[model samples]
Every structure is written in structure tokens, then in C-alpha cells.
Target chain A: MHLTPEEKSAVTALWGKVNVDEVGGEAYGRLLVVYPWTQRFFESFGDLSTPDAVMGNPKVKAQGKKVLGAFSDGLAHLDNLKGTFATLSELHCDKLHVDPENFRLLGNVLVCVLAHHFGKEFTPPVQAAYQKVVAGVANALAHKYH
Target chain B: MLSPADKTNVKAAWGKVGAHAGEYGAEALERMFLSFPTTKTYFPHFDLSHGSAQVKGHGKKVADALTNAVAHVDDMPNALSALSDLHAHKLRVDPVNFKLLSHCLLVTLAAHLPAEFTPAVHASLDKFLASVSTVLTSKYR
Candidate 1:
């Protein structure tokens, strides 16, 4: 699924505004608030509130919260948001939940939508990374997401 | 742009700040938590009322996680992806709930701010929310 030029550009623009150090903590809260269900994943085993519960147990909960935040924060950095999403799309392209055939198309479509909002400034590396991350995520999900 | 040295500086600062997650980040988060009762809607989902200590303890976990994340800012992508896999595999949250969260959080932020919040904060928030949605939907996908 080839990203349209417009989508590619938008990816870049969105990438420009990311800042991990500034927003990491708040963003993590935002993630839980937005997907409180995800917190259920956090709570299934170890206590998220307790350091040892999560880190020590290191199952779906502790490790899960950490990964979710990092992926978002990576993209939220000054020039990585679009790439992050693009990569996010890649991560799931071949997952069991997402039909195999629809992966690239899904990613391309998402990148285009992001481009519409992001405008024209997305870089080539950004575009490529976007594709890479999405695939990486998809691959990881196929294996570890269980 | 933060140079490697600057990154080191920022991480160091974040470590100190993150250690006090309940005291600093949690306060603001709690204020937002208070302003947005919608967030409270999810309380039944968990045992939020278990106790302030428990709740604060959870808040601290969130804080420390983010703080360590900041300290190792560059590795966030890989880190967050791992998190996505965990949520998808373990908790099994529905995707739509993520979008609902965005509205609830925005409302909370608006109500709590001294006035209108800055675009920087809001945009950063929007991006943050998108990530949440991504994790949810991707997990489902």
C-alpha cells in the first residue's frame, strides 16, 4: 500500500510536534483515560500502582503499560508522531485480528488521513519509518500479543 | 532540538520528577481526574476507591513509568509497542472505549484549566490520545 504524496506530507507535519520529555507523563495518563479498557490489561495480574507488582511479575500488565507509552511517546517526540503512527500501523499489518491482505491498504489509508490533518511536510524517512513501525508492531503482535 | 547532552539533562530531571509522580504528576492528574467525572465512569472498572493510597499508588506507577520513559526518551517507540502487545493480549479492552476517553479527557482539561488550555498542550494531548486509540485498535486488529 503506497502512501499518497499528501499522506506522506501530513505524516511529516504531525511528526514535527512530538515531545516525549514534555508530555510523557501526561500522555500516559491520557492513554489510560482514553482506553481505560487497556488498564484492564494492566490490572489482570500485577498492580500497576505497585512497582514490584508489574516489573517483578513482568507479564501482560507491567510490560504492557511500558510499551504502550513508549510507542506513543516516540512518535509524540518533535518529529516522530506521524512516523510513530505509521509504524504503529505497520506493527499490526499482519496480525491475526487485522486481515493479512488489508494490512498495507489499512496503513496507507491511515497515513493519508493523518496527512490530511498534518499537511505537507512529511519526509521520506518519516514515510519509510511509518511503514516499518507498522510492520514491526504487526509482527510483534502476531508473536507476543498473546 | 535536544542534543544528546540535552537528552541526558532532560532524562536526569525527569528521573527526579518522576520519582515523585504521586506528588507532582498525580496532583495535576487528580485535578483533571476530579474535573472529569467521566473518567470516574471507569472507576467501577477498577477498584479506584480501594483507597487514596491505592489510587495514589496507581498514579505513582503511571508516573514512574512515564518518568523512566522520559529518561530513555529515544527508546519510547519500542517501549510503547511492547505495551500495546500486553494490553491486546491480556486486558482485551474494546477499541471504541479509547475514542470515548479522548472526549472525557478534553472535557476534563477544559474544565480544570485556568482558562482555555494552550494549543501545544491540547495538540500534544490529541497526539497522545491517538496513540491510545492505536494501541486499542491495533490490539483488536
Candidate 2:
């Protein structure tokens, strides 16, 4: 919430560099493989029965883009994360009954995606800035609980 | 996957870590869960509070696995073949999580065994974990 100007630059600078769609695919597959139990929530997201199955599934990839797209929305509207994720919070909590913790899970997954995808370029400072962004996004995603 | 020095460094580090690997292993898992909450979904049966007993036991298992890896550093593929099948076909986890847990393991060792976790040793230890992860996830294909 109190991101310094430099931290904001770190975040904003990196956002413009990568393909969010590819990141979404990587993050989504990583999430499924790392936490196979999460597969239950994505039954409609293709086979996803095996770790390899996740990466090749077009549906999974598409959903990943959607997931990351939400992250981009939050990233652009840092000032109103709570408002931006309001519909998702309601949909997740009231309609879908998904665990609020998944928000945090997905957020962290995105951080990992950026880390491995960018390799050494994902410097410690950039990581710290991204972490703050993820934490804020997680809180925003699960705002309904609060 | 490792040079002679890399093997030696990994063995040296594991020597100190092996005895209480289970003890320190929990810290690694704890860090993983804390840093990446998504991983917790895999262990729904276990309590994921700060230092749950189940986590302790699971960490011990991790230690056992690593210790075994230490013994067969030269033949890790054969040694870890079973685990490769289990983790790939049975457990169905992506090897990426291995990198996350390995990151935490390095952090735990750095904090607890600072003197031994030197730059070179850290590199070897990381390689060791990476090799183990690769072997474990080798069967999914």
C-alpha cells in the first residue's frame, strides 16, 4: 500500500517488458503442478490430469491468460485494487465458494513465474517490488473475507 | 551434473545437515509454505500452522530423501528412479515446485549453517537439489 517511488518504477518498468499471455501459461501450469490439489477447481480447464498435460492444454493456457489479465488489471489500478477485484471477490466467495487462500496462491505463483521466466534479470530489488505487488493483489483478490 | 568439487562440497554440507536434516528439514518446508502458500494445497491432510508435527515428520522424510541422494550422488538417476515414478506418475507434481522447495532449503541451511553454506558450497548444494529434482520429475514424459 505504501510503495515507494522507486519500487513503483521497478514494478512499472518490468510490466512493460514481458508477454503477459506466456506468463499466464507458465504461471497456470506451475500452479497446477506445484499444487495438484488445485486441479479440482479447474475441471473444466481441460484434462490437467498430469503435470505435462497442463502445459499443452489450450484451455489451460487460455485460462492462464485470463488469470494473468486480472493481475494486469490490478497492477494498472494499484490505487483501487479493492474496487477492481470486487466482482471477483463476490464471484469467488458468494457464487463459486472457492477458498480465499487461492488468491494468495495464484499471486505467489505469478511471482515465481516472473522469477524463473526472467532468469537473472529478475533482480532482488525488482523481486521485492513484485512481491509487494503480489501481496497487494492477493489482499485485493480476497477482499471479501475482510 | 556435478564436478568433483561440486560433489565434495555437496557431501560436506550434507554431512552437517544429515544428522539433523529432519529437524532442519521442517524449517525448509515451513519456509516453502510461508513463501508459497499454493504449495500447501498438496498437504491438506497435514496441519500447516507455523510448526505442525506433521510438517516435522514430512520434513524428516525430505531429509531422508536428501540423505539418500547424498549417498548415491554418482548414481542419482538409478537411486531416485522410484521417486521419479512416484512423484511424476503417482504424486503428479510439476518439477517447478522442486525449485521452490530447493530455494527454501538453501535459505534454511544458510541461516542454520552459515559457516558451511559458503558461496561455492551453496552452488553445489543448489546443483544437488536440482539434480534430485530433475530425476524425480524425469518420468512424467
Output the number of the DockQ-best candidate.
1
lDDT of 2 by residue, A1-146 (tens): 77898998889888989898998988888877776655666777768767788888898898899888888867878778889888887676555645555666777888888888789989999999888888887877677642
Off by over 4 Å in 1: A1-146, B1-20, B23-46, B71-74, B99-117, B132-137
Q: Could you say which candidate leads in lDDT? A: 2
| Separate DockQ for every predicted complex | 0.08, 0.04
> Candidate 2's residue-wise lDDT over B1-141, tens digit each?
699999999888889875789988999999988897556546656788876899999889889988988999899888878777777656566455788999999999999996898888988888888888888877765
Error of 1 at A143 (Å): 39
lDDT (CA) per prediction: 0.47, 0.81
Among all candidates shown, the one with the greatest TM-score = 2
Q: Candidate 1, residues B1-141: lDDT per residue as tens digits?
A: 334654554444444443454554445445544554334433443444424665666666655655555544555556667667765656454544456545554554445553434555555555555654564356543
Error of 2 at A131 (Å): 20
**What is candidate 1's lDDT per residue for A40-137, written digit by digit as tens?**
42455544553333334435333435544555554334233445455444443323133232323334543453444446554566666577655544
**Decoy 1 TM-score against native:** 0.33
Worst 10 contiguous positions by lDDT, candidate 2 chain A = A93-102
